[PDB]
Amino acid sequence: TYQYNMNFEKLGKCIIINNKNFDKVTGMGVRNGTDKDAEALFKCFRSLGFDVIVYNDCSCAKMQDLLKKASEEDHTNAACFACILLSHGEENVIYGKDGVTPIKDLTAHFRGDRCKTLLEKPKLFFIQACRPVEADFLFAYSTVPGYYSWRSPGRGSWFVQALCSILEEHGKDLEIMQILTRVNDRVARHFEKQIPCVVSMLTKELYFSQ
Amino acid sequence: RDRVPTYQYNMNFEKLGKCIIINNKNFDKVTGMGVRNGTDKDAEALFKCFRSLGFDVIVYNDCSCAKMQDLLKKASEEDHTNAACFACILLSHGEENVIYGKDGVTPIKDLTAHFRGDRCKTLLEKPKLFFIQACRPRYKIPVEADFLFAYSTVPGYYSWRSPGRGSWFVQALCSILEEHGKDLEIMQILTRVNDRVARHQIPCVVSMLTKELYFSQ
């Protein structure tokens, strides 16, 4: 009653945009580690039951088309939708490899109206980007685009590490907010700066199980 | 599903915390803002509600911008050492990143900054809750841990402060808190409020909290 009905054929689709090499004409160097993060995320989410697909070095066109096309799909037997973005970011904007595109435009497509099939179902956006308020949307930022998010060349971001670890072990028993909160604490505890940020328009508790 | 974890905010303190409610109903003509009929009804339900949770609630009304800033700053300079948390509720007119005082408009972000870890070390590691009902996204928020923002309406749209029933968000918040304030976790309460408000406009919660928040046991 107080939970999102997960009784569906599929858990849902999980698009993982992984931008690592940005065209010079943007002024943003390679994101060594995003490859580590991504693989981690791929497993973690595939493990939750998502039909996950990874897209590398996407342009603002590719990224917009991707999200556009996905929203257009039929999500009837889908429990929800998940999108994970990994790249450079600024004021509410995400970096393509050839420029910058506004996050709002990526989520726009899945709004209640533009995507009848996902209506009433959770839309999840996990955004990791160092430098659209509609119901049932949830955003989880590695940290605001302005403040820097700590990585580790061959170890990946703390956020992603924490998120995959927590999800790996509790992705089945904790509610989505509990997990993200632990991710919050864990990322936070690293410094002892950066604190992830969760924005939730969810109307029911979210559980990737039963 | 819910149980015994070091994943809960330590609530074992002398007192629960202070709860500041700013009830701006009347605004200076020059601001062009109208009377917020129904705000007193929210203010009353809110004060009773939080008083009931164990908060030491203080209610200010028709405050000026200078007043709001001063009040919150002073609140941040007090010694919250024996308090478990801190709550501030703003009921007024709103606009992108700003909230109205009677004499004008001031940035929500500055109002909340007063409590950042480095400026209110006595609330450090302690949840700082802001419930904002600014009629009329992470941006108008401090980059600090243990902060929680529950925005009344769409930080892009307008909430419907009912003529003489009280804003939908507020009333829903109080309703759910009366009922489960002492048995549900903060995100559970607000998520239900979200649903409730939506079953009528969608409120949004920004959480930087690092632990679960239970007001009791």
From Swiss-Prot, chain A:
GO cellular component: cytoplasm; cytosol; extracellular space; fibrillar center; nucleoplasm; nucleus; plasma membrane
Modified residues (Phosphoserine): S157
Active-site feature positions: H88, C130
Tissue: Highly expressed in lung, skeletal muscle, liver, kidney, spleen and heart, and moderately in testis. No expression in the brain.
Catalyses which reaction(s): Strict requirement for an Asp residue at position P1 and has a preferred cleavage sequence of Asp-Glu-Val-Asp-|-
Disulphide-bridged cysteine pairs: none
GO molecular function, one term: aspartic-type endopeptidase activity
Documented effect of changing R131K: Does not significantly affect thiol protease catalytic efficiency
Chain segments carrying region Loop L1: 20-31
Domain comment in the entry: The exosite polybasic region mediates non-specific RNA-binding, acting as a bridge for RNA-binding target proteins, such as PARP1. The exosite is also required for interaction with non-RNA-binding proteins, such as Hsp90 co-chaperone PTGES3.
Protein name, entry field: Caspase-7
Encoding gene (name): CASP7
